[PDB]
Amino acid sequence: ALSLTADQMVSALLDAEPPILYSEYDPTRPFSMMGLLTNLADRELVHMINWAKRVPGFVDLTLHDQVHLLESAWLEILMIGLVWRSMEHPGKLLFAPNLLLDRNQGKSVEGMVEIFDMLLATSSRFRMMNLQGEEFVCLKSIILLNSGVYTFTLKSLEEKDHIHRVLDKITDTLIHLMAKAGLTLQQQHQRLAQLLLILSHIRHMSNKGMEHLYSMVPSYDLLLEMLD
Amino acid sequence: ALSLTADQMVSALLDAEPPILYSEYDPTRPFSMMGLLTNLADRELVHMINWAKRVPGFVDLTLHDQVHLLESAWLEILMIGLVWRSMEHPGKLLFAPNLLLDRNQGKSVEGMVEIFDMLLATSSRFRMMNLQGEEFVCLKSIILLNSGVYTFTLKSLEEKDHIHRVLDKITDTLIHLMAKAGLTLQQQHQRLAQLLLILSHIRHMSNKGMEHLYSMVPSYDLLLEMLD
């Protein structure tokens, strides 16, 4: 992972990309939204485990650390995936190709429209920045590696050091993508910052979402079982 | 604000710095922690309003937008201030020069040790990066401008554009501080990213804190009254 060039990193992440899934409702039957959003989230998680295993550097970590990172990040990762898919559908969230929802559809569950609104605003922000596919995959891997790295022994010190070196490789890669796109050195650092600052909002959204779910979620054991 | 050089930006933010406050307990009397932490937070907020008014670009915004940004950011701002103060006190949080608390002292309030632990880990991270005073003030201003900018009309479009241009000026400034410190172009972009990625964790901490407080906070009106 640490010997990868920028191009190889990008290629590795594009190749790791999980599939776009479909919602499981009978489309011949009349139009629970929570049920739909929960089942879809559950199925995407399985694919997320597989994707994570293909992010360079991730399988170098201990099982326990892999679980911790996924436990911290999974909802952020679903949400960034959603916002990216939704980017060319103004005012709509593309949960699946057959489940494209507006804010009014979110109003049927108490507390949900607020979450839909934040996701829609993020998709809007991505649209305004003209986020590229290659930048998206970098950001999604940054979330996986970064979200739990501050909440973890000699092994632990080595693990954190490795995570930060891999994150540095992804930073390098982002800059290289922006240099290749023809941005000036100024523009490259400005855009890097703009992209990383959106991750704080994605964190925020995840916290607001987890709050909703706790008020009613993959356990450590399920993540461990799937990762192990 | 947008015509400022890097040096002028840094000078402006250092000059805006609020004071370090003292806790209000009688030190001759025997050692409520929540009361102490609440009163201190309340007094710091007043100074935060004043500090915010001196961040270049902030008073250019509408009152409503200034309030929204502070409403979103205030706990993140207190927390980054805390973590910065605590940096050269391993295992302790320097809430005030007369209130230096360890994790065990946090255990007296249910849910508080978890929050103390996350703050301590952030201070540890800052220590490992050797965070500079000049970088800290940049980051604290980034929090103010960024935390609410995704959760807000023609005026609103102009406001967001301005906020992002000011954020770009702070990104420029950070890079300039790192170039002046002698870091290579690679090191500059890596360190920029490392610093901005810590902001996601600060967001996380704030959400976890606000959760605690809601389960029991400055209203819009109080912030508005103080800002207006």
Ligand SMILES: C[C@@H]1Cc2c([nH]c3ccccc23)[C@@H](c2c(F)cc(/C=C/C(=O)O)cc2F)N1CC(C)(C)F
């Ligand atoms: C709207 C958000 C984000 C989201 C959801 N479902 C998705 C499917 C694909 C991509 C993104 C999502 C949905 C969502 C949901 F409605 C239920 C669960 C429950 C999962 C479980 O019980 O394991 C998870 C979700 F992500 N979520 C709501 C919330 C409150 C978490 F922000």
Ligand SMILES: C[C@@H]1Cc2c([nH]c3ccccc23)[C@@H](c2c(F)cc(/C=C/C(=O)O)cc2F)N1CC(C)(C)F
């Ligand atoms: C430990 C955290 C962060 C914090 C607190 N007090 C500070 C004073 C100076 C600097 C930082 C802090 C404390 C804190 C507190 F214990 C009560 C309030 C309540 C304020 C209000 O009611 O207006 C605010 C706080 F920041 N906080 C706990 C929590 C749960 C919010 F994360």
